[PDB]
Amino acid sequence: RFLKVKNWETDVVLTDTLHLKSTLETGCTEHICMGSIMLPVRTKDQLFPLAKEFLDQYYSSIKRFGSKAHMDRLEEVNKEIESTSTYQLKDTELIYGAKHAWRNASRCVGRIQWSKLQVFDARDCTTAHGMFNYICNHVKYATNKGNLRSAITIFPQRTDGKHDFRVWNSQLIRYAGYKQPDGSTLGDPANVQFTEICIQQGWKAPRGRFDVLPLLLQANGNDPELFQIPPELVLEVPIRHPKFDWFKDLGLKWYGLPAVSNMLLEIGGLEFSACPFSGWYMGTEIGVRDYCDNSRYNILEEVAKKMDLDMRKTSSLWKDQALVEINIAVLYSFQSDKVTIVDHHSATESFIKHMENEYRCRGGCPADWVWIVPPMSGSITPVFHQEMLNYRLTPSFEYQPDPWNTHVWKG
Amino acid sequence: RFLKVKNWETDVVLTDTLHLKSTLETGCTEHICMGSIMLPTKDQLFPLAKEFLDQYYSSIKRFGSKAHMDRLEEVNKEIESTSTYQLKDTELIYGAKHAWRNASRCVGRIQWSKLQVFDARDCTTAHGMFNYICNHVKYATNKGNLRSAITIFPQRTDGKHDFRVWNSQLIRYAGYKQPDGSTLGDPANVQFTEICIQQGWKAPRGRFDVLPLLLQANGNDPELFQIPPELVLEVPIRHPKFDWFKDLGLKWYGLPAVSNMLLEIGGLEFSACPFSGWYMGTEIGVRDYCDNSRYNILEEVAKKMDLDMRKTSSLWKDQALVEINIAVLYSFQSDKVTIVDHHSATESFIKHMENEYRCRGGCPADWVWIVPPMSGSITPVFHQEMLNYRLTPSFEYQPDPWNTHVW
């Protein structure tokens, strides 16, 4: 069965056959669409099919499907499974796996870049200190003095579920939040819970508005341990505006490296619970969401105050005016300091080209419209007008529960 | 089967049970989400009628009364006898209000129970239709103080005697392709504009010509009529800061009146049911004015503003967009024509959702349509999880009649 998507701006119609390879469920039924819901110990049994499906896809990608090398690999994985109950990926299969998880990430607008990914194999890692060293190397390589390079570091896979490797941070680099006694928050409200854990684990918090968090790292199912990323490895950008000279006096800055570290990478039925990955920012992530969400830094009022906009009626669009100026500032600051960033016009246009190419070469491109359309100026970006099909392919990045909810403390 | 929706900004969680009453299908399966796709007999009729009458009698606290059973009996007898049935006025009104209440793409539903329902089921000709429509236009416009209204023409019979308004809204601007290669006026209306011309309309061939009505009664060939211009309230667009804005020569109409949809109540199909409320500013200023395939004015506005149009990263498009939208709102307000900004409308809708969850067990909503096309995440609906599903009575899409009609 063939499925059509249409772009309502261009009338370009595309045909999807890739969705036929989809296994994992969506959350939707014939009676309910859950397309806007944020979040809608494996046995030998289920494992060999998952391995096989993956190795068939790998061997096809390399034009060796059905070859002796393909068949010997299936056989060797099969024996390894029923003997040791799991298996190990070859380096080439891991790299391919990690790239495809990104290729298949339906909420990622940056996927035109999917094949340029530096994969760091950290499967020989055994301790939290080993992890810290790996993560430092990743930050330094990815940062590259502002000329950002996509990378992923992959710690050992899950075994019995009791020896998991985890990065407790939700991103490698992120700012602390501190609920105050009067009920206000200092710093980033998204990171209050995790900040409170670090403090409990013995971090001495500077208690400012932009304190880079320490890494809280769990190796081999052991209690996690704290480490400070050397400050010389943490690239940051002071935020100023090309025209408004008071803008710098808001005291704003952000870090250049967006490094999601709390997701789970599934490849061939194997579960890599610590797999921090980074690219570079689209300006709206910081300018729209991190700065202007009500539950984040929430700077809209203070900015609009300085701009002396009419704030007594929403229909002045004072919020919308302030929002553009803030986003101009983020992009200007990053460009001026020569740190990679992409604007939402450039990034969405690239994605449409990516998506069309994928339909031609691959038979489809799973995409989550709710996430792909940028959080400001939605309909003046080409994605708003693009119909999309969302379905789940493996290899994949998946959510997992926060480790503090599940971890059995050793003491 | 009992479903939670979370607001990620406020942490408020709502439990949805209303979805279990869902009748129609979404387009989605467990393998594929189609959430962003625009368009995803006697035997048939009695279940649909029963389901509707049951919810009606429940709504007036008479579920299982003799008057409930008697009406079920009487409708049943009438379908058996005539293969269709007629709604009582009270059922018609209830059904239309509920079709709006159920409209998952409508952000304006806090208003759902204040709807003036005009019963045009006695209408027989296109002239009749024109009369009913002018009355609706005048009623709803109300010299700028807009009132929600719907006008309901006769229900489908054998599908060869359909009433249709061929226009997509009661009031829209014409579109003409020129030698040029380009388009004058509204590109969305080019083909319908041609149909009018080929039917006999003398087009003034300008940028903002109000189209004629093309009206189909009882399955006949449709007929042209001009709405008295005195009934079409329009707003010149100026900006409260930029004097040059008026020189762009932009205007829009006050009454948004969708006329191409199909109202289904208790299995009956009302193929001409034009309805109107009032505008949210973004519909005009973001979509109608700035879509590349609509009036597409971003570039002219940005030039007038002397912004750096060399690079997308200067956010010149975004800057022009905000100002165009300030100008729309300012102009409607200055002229006392009802309009709502996207902050106000989305705040109301979040309140409406809480009311519906509390009093009804849920509120079908399509997040893709509900989130404004500008400044999405600085409105509260962006952060609101929504469940989309189909309840009846409903408004449904139907194919444009020119592909259907036998001349």
Ligand code: HEM
């Ligand atoms: C190279 C530049 C990249 C850009 C500009 C980019 C852009 C983005 C953006 C804007 C989002 C949404 C973020 C949010 O709203 O929180 C995102 C999500 C995501 N991207 Fe990327 N991306 C990039 C690289 C990568 C890389 C290297 C990977 C993994 C190898 C990746 C995988 C993801 C995943 C899994 C998500 C979903 C995260 C979630 O659900 O929280 N992307 N991308």
Ligand code: HEM
């Ligand atoms: C009172 C003021 C109202 C406001 C502010 C309003 C707001 C809106 C908006 C912004 C849309 C999206 C339109 C688009 O993007 O093209 C919409 C869609 C819709 N509304 Fe309303 N609405 C109002 C009244 C009504 C009324 C009176 C009805 C019917 C009785 C109705 C039924 C619908 C339907 C069926 C749609 C979806 C149409 C489609 O899919 O093209 N609304 N509403």
Ligand SMILES: C[C@H](O)[C@H](O)[C@H]1CNc2nc(N)[nH]c(=O)c2N1
């Ligand atoms: C409820 C809703 O799904 C939620 O707010 C989503 C909307 N779209 C998003 N899109 C992106 N890219 N990132 C997000 O965090 C969200 N939040």
Ligand SMILES: C[C@H](O)[C@H](O)[C@H]1CNc2nc(N)[nH]c(=O)c2N1
């Ligand atoms: C492809 C996508 O579904 C389409 O562009 C939608 C997106 N959201 C929308 N939302 C509203 N209110 N109106 C629209 O016409 C659209 N168009």
Ligand SMILES: N=C(CO)NCCC[C@H](N)C(=O)O
């Ligand atoms: N561009 C990326 C990954 O390359 N996004 C990662 C998520 C970052 C999050 N949205 C933030 O604002 O910190």
Ligand SMILES: N=C(CO)NCCC[C@H](N)C(=O)O
């Ligand atoms: N507010 C409404 C109906 O009350 N919108 C209906 C569709 C109008 C269309 N979006 C337009 O911009 O002309």
Ligand SMILES: [Zn+2]
């Ligand atoms: Zn869906």
